[PDB]
Write a protein that binds this DNA or RNA. Structure first.
Lengths: 380, 62, 132
RNA sequence: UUUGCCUCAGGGUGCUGUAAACAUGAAAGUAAACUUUACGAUCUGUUGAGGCUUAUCCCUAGUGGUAAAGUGU
RNA sequence: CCUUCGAUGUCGGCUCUUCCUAUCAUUGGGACGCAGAAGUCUCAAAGUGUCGGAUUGUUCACCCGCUAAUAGGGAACGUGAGCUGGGUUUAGACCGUCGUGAGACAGGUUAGUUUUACCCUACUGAUGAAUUUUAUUAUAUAUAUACAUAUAGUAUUGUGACAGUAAUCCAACUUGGUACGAGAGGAUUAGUUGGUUCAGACAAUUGGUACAGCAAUUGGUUGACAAACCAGUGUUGCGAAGCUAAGUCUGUUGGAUAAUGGCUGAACGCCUCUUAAGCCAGAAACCAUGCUGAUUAAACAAUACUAUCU
RNA sequence: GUCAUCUAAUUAGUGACGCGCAUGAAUGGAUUAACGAGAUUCCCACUGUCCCUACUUGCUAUCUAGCGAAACCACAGCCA
RNA sequence: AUGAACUAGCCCUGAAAAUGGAUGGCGCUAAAGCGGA
RNA sequence: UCUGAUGGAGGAUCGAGUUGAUACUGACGUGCAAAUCGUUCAUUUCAAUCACGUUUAGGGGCGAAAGACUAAUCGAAAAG
């Protein structure tokens, strides 16, 4: 018979199966729709989750209970050393999907890039990409001309530089970033002129911009149904334990449905969150990356004692409003919004008032080590 | 940037860190951290805690 | 006349006994329902600072006793986050007996009143001695 | 898997809360000599000291080490 | 009384999922004895949601209250190797009535053991080979070829058939004391700011957590100090890191339609939305978009390097 | 059952009413201080019972070396 | 060649149920349907 | 009559042990165990507990009474 009291199901069926992700790297399922009018431009970037802090900003929301008052907001730091563009891949549409026409490489690729092709680089002869790169320029131009003539989707192979990060990993994360913009004539030259040079984050993204984040969530091994799906605990008197679903299906159908929550893997899931606002794009060069015009102090984004479980951010970074899936050191792929947003939050120009760099280990009271030593005075 | 003063200790509280507490009389107190909040709630006087700035002042070793 | 209350950490579920903090005559309020609470299966209706609740008095004048009457929370002992970046909590939970329209049936509030409740209910702020 | 990594150490960052020892130092008082000497919870100075801090914290071409070379194609 | 008496565990509740629509609310309409407001009848529509409690074993019921609404049902009266065991329904015992009696009661009451999964499948997660009578949306300097092409290992980047899918509702204020109305009252729609439920993450902050760590201390014990140890974690404070919610962040727009309202327009000299042909606008529905898997396609592509090889 | 009370809400409890299906006097009637691992209702205190779960410890589980059963079994095991 | 009223063939409304679903399936409309020959 | 001591009665009280077995309707339920384990609980000067010896034997015994017990067997034991 019917349920005495209805209530919504537990968990979303749209994230099934809750299995382990294939890869640690976030994979873009789809890029934003191509707009012919806009000039050619990159669409995605890669960084690493360094940690998070909080900032103070002045709200400019009229008719809100906050408005003129200053607000503390949590923000994630994603270290983004410049990516290196190394390849061009052209796609053409077929009734069977997108088909690669060919990929064209640059004349030189980093050892960091070549490491990604090896499982045992240290014992290898490192012979990858050694004799396919000295191909004559005539064939290169022929391949680009055929891509121009036939292809309709262009992507640039680009890779990260983990040597510029505190990561133990040495092999680069490589991925293709789709170029959206003018015709293929313009797309090809836009990528060719950047076929070897570094790609900084500032080229891809602007401050105060909404972006999507693609990353693999934090893993938790196998978890019970109570933690995995949020089912209600059974009463204390239950004979064979209470941390389980009581009825896992009616008599008929004489099967267990796939919609029934069960124990299994929790975390390490691929996720694509939308609408994370970039609060600041901090640069490697400047010494006031974490300073605001209302603070005028000389400090960088890394909190005293370093980002816990990550290290020091010595490169470009972006301060992302809110949280992002994944642990520290997790590679986060930032993607341009699928459709540009004209909402008030999307178009808002945030004015950062203060960025906290106190120790994230324990409860830090100081913003800088100099401030700490000045406060305590001389010691033994 | 403008920081407040902790009530149990003299430490500076930067924005987004501490916690406030209002007594019966409407008197408001600010505490930097959970330790200070706990000690104030158990009503331990900072003057008798060796590591506190109040103790340092009362023993004249600033 | 503006109900953009902004979320405050929920405390005071149904069945909580709080102080009356007013000169209406009652000494405590027994929360039996929270106005505007929706429908979740085993969720106890819980109230926050500015929330209007339905309550009965267990100690107080007999004309106030044994009746269902509206109250408005003014002090809460559960820490809640002010958007300026800190957390606040009182020493006790307290609310004032009020007309379902929103005007207090007493005349004064004994203790401090949270600013979140004050800006939500105008005449409560007028009758409040100390606003925190 | 040799500009790495592990290790210990140093530094940072924190957590706790001021270590052991010494002091014709204090200490409610006590007793014992021809004014000093014994006992004394506890307190003070040296002492924001001492201890701990990755094992899933941060930095360091700082120390020492980085092993046999087996299996499939 | 058709099956089951060499046994299909027979009430209710809790838990959890799915389905139906004879739709309670939400979406868009038509009618009204429709001024507005509120409401009633009705159509397309099952996407989303349908609550907290007092009494009772109850289903049913009835009140208190919130709500937008607190709709009706199915799944062996869904669900006992899921629980519980209050009731019913063994043996003890009490009362009332009945019986000469043993005893009876579709009368009341109290106490009364709830067994097994390690098998198959299903489901949830986790490894993983093999795949030529197999595959092909091309491959070749405006130009031929299936009478062809394709060895294999590692490795990366991809394609994405197919399967799943997700957001939901409310309030206040502005429009506006406006339209309407004699007044009394009093909107729709749009916008703004918030919130409920749900979903997916996250730990900067707050809180929780302690067999990291420091400190204190009771009983005992090592002659004392020191250092300790035992008391199944001796007890206390504080307690980083890590987990964690009660904390924090995020949660699209297109196509084609249904109801309905229409266009042109015969049938039927007129008329007619078509109850002909030919068209339009149109819903929380549908399909896409987006998201999740893709040893769900025993699937495939491009690239890098190589195996005495060709 | 009706009326009071208890609650916010009382098929519960208690106090009353009594043409009592079918109460009643050693089938013992009415009442009783003290006593009870007896049945029942309410209040204070208390708390993870609950809102709404989280973290944590021991012993298992788990993987390995060794040792090593049983119940059950027509044949078997995807669905509409 | 107009207005009516009947009549009876096929079609339509009447015609709502729970796992997903069944003229046996695919499908079929110049039938692969209905009634004949 | 009242007050303070003394005194040490009671099928008096708490409570280990002993003797049991209220609850978790906990564990276990292919058990350590054909009744156990843990916590909780009842009992301790008496109608108290224990041992050995001895009596009562089956339509019989024995029963502070449950159709209880009478060698894992009881609304008529076990053996032939």
């Amino acid at each position: 018979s019917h349920r005495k009291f209805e209530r919504p199901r537990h968990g979303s069926l749209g994230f099934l199966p809750r299995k382990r992700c294939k890869r640690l790297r976030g994979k873009i399922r789809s890029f934003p729709k191509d707009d012919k009018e806009k000039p050619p431009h990159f669409t995605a970037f890669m960084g690493y989750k360094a940690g998070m802090t909080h900032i103070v900003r002045e709200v400019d929301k009229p008719g809100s209970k906050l408005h003129k008052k200053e607000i503390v907001e949590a923000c994630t730091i994603i270290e983004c050393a410049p990516m290196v563009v190394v390849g061009i891949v052209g796609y053409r549409e077929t009734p069977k999907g997108l088909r690669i026409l060919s990929t064209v490489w640059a004349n030189h690729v980093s050892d960091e890039f070549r490491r990604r092709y090896y499982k045992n680089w240290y014992k290898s002869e490192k012979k990858a990409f050694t004799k396919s790169l000295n191909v004559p320029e005539a064939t290169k131009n022929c391949l680009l001309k055929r891509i121009e003539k036939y292809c309709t989707v262009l992507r640039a192979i680009c890779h990260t530089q983990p040597s510029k990060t505190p990561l133990r990993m040495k092999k680069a994360h490589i991925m293709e970033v789709q170029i959206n913009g003018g015709s293929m004539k313009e797309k090809l030259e836009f990528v060719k002129e950047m076929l070897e040079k570094n790609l900084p984050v500032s080229t891809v993204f602007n401050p105060n911009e909404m972006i999507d984040v693609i990353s693999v969530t934090k893993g938790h091994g196998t978890k019970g149904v109570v933690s995995r799906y949020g089912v209600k605990r059974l009463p204390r008197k239950t004979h064979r334990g209470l941390r389980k679903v009581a009825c896992i299906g009616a008599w008929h159908p004489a099967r267990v449905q796939f919609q029934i929550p069960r124990h299994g893997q929790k975390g390490y899931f691929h996720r694509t969150e939308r609408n994370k606002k970039i609060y600041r794009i901090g640069l490697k060069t400047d010494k006031n990356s974490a300073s605001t015009d209302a603070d005028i102090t000389e400090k960088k984004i890394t909190p005293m004692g370093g980002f816990p479980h990550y290290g020091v951010v010595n490169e470009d970074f972006l301060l992302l409003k809110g949280c992002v899936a994944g642990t520290k050191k997790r590679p986060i792929t930032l993607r341009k919004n699928i459709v540009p947003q004209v909402s008030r939050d999307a178009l808002a120009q945030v004015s950062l008032k203060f960025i906290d760099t106190s120790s994230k280990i324990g409860h830090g009271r100081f913003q800088t080590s100099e401030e700490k030593v000045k406060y305590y005075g001389p010691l033994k | 940037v403008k920081t407040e003063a902790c009530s149990f200790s003299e430490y500076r509280i930067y924005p987004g860190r501490g916690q406030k507490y209002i007594a019966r009389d409407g008197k408001v107190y600010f505490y930097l951290s959970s330790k200070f909040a706990s000690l104030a709630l158990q009503k331990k006087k900072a003057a008798k805690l060796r590591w506190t700035q109040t103790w340092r002042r009362n023993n004249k070793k600033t | 006349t503006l109900k953009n209350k902004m979320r405050i950490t929920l405390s005071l579920p149904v069945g909580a006994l709080i102080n009356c903090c007013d000169n209406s005559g009652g000494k405590n309020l027994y929360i039996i329902a929270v106005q505007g609470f929706g429908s979740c299966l085993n969720r106890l209706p819980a109230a926050s600072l500015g929330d209007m609740v339905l309550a009965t008095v267990k100690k107080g004048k007999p004309d106030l006793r044994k009746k269902v009457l509206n109250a408005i929370i003014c002090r809460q002992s559960k820490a809640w986050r002010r958007h300026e970046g800190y957390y606040i909590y009182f020493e006790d939970n307290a609310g004032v007996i009020v007309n379902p329209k929103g005007e207090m049936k007493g005349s004064a509030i004994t203790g401090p009143v949270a600013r979140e409740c004050a800006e939500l209910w105008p005449k409560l702020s007028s009758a409040a001695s100390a606003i925190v």
